[PDB]
DNA sequence: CGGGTTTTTGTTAAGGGCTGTATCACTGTG
DNA sequence: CACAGTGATGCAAATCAAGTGTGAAGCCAGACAAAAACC
DNA sequence: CACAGTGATACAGCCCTTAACAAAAACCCG
DNA sequence: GGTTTTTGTCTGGCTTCACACTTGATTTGCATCACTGTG
């Protein structure tokens, strides 16, 4: 398997 | 026999109705989130509340979840007092 | 260095509901 | 025997901050087992 | 041009659903 | 009787809250005082 790379996955009581 | 209201059943007459649930809640939790389950449901209950019109609600329940604000200083309970044209007794 | 992938945030319009503020002719101490 | 103020004063009652080791309670695991209201 | 009310009423702001699309920020690797 | 709901329990293990003592150190509650205002 080969990393696609994304935006990293924060907390979701740190999101809007 | 029927069944009742959910809110006026028990603390322990209320699990059989989220034992089904609490299994695809936690497994999400895991896989997507990390494993919290308070968390994803104050995330969940705050939707709800907020797409039910309950905003006042919601903003109670994010207080009591932070810091608790309550309590107000005597220099802005007194300048109410003042500027509010109070009495003392009042 | 820059596509590629993943994730974050916003946008379009029709309705409903709560919340905030301007507007109206007046008040009083003279 | 009008009644709701009017605010400062002062004493009594209530709550708490300091120290650690207990008790007492709620809940988790998945499963088994009796009461009770409609047919 | 005194200035802070005084309360009922009506209109604007902010925000929720539908769903598909668009602008933008963080890593991966050729 | 059937069916569904509603409570009950099972033991080991976990967390969470209350208290057992003492001595002060505050914070808070409420009665007292001679008066007003509408006639």
Excluded at chain 1, 1 to 12: E, M, S, T
Excluded at chain 2, 47 to 66: F, G, K, P, W
Aim: with cysteine; hydrophobic share 35%.
């Amino acid at each position: 398997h080969i990393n696609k790379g994304g935006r990293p996955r924060q907390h979701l009581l740190s999101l809007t | 026999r029927p069944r009742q209201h959910l809110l006026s059943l028990t603390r322990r007459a209320q699990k059989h109705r989220l034992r089904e649930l609490k299994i695809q809640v936690k497994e999400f939790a895991d896989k997507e989130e990390g494993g919290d389950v308070k968390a994803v449901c104050l995330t969940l209950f705050l939707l709800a509340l907020r797409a039910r019109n309950e905003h006042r609600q919601a903003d109670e329940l994010e207080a009591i979840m932070q810091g608790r604000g309550s309590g107000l200083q005597p220099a802005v309970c007194l300048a109410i007092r003042v500027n509010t044209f109070l009495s003392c007794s009042q």
